[PDB]
Amino acid sequence: GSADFTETFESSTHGEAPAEWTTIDADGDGQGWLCLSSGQLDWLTAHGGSNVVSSFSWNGMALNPDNYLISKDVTGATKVKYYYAVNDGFPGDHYAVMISKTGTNAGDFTVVFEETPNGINKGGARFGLSTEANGAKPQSVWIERTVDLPAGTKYVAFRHYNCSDLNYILLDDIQFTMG
Ligand SMILES: [Ca+2]
Ligand SMILES: [Ca+2]
């Protein structure tokens, strides 16, 4: 449709929640979804431009996330297409795509897609916001997904949850088909 648009995270800033999204730290550990820039982290390469959004299940220490990343009102959206990346040495950073037809409370969302990413499942280094800047870069391939949105979808959420002590999930180039 004519209102089709993409979230690139290029207008957001390293270390902040993305501009025009809201977040929930539902597990309560003070760690959630943050914009990261490749201009600040040597290990990171974005799918497009310099910026991504990120959520960690290991970041200097092991975590048990339940972190929601929630869109603006996208009433009219029929499809969301996006790219994700994980550390392919520790790939299983489980996530869901959810929709709400009403509000932005966690309970307003229902799962429409979820998966546990695959990888070499092979070990290696883990990467964080405090990991030493020795120039290593993870084995980390960008993977496309296209998810059907039920009629009435108003907000789309990405939920990193149901996993622990792997590494990260990154998202970029989240395109909403409006329719
Ligand atoms: Ca980007
Ligand atoms: Ca959290």
Swiss-Prot record:
<comment type="function">
    <text>Cysteine proteinase with a strong preference for substrates with Lys in the P1 position. Hydrolyzes bovine hemoglobin, bovine serum albumin, casein, human placental type I collagen and human IgA and IgG. Disrupts the functions of polymorphonuclear leukocytes. May act as a virulence factor in the development of peridontal disease. Involved in the coaggregation of P.gingivalis with other oral bacteria. Has hemolytic activity; this is mediated by the adhesin domains and does not require the catalytic domain.</text>
</comment>
<protein>
    <recommendedName>
        <fullName>Lys-gingipain W83</fullName>
    </recommendedName>
</protein>
<feature type="site" description="Cleavage; site 4">
    <location>
        <begin position="137"/>
        <end position="138"/>
    </location>
</feature>
<comment type="similarity">
    <text>Belongs to the peptidase C25 family.</text>
</comment>
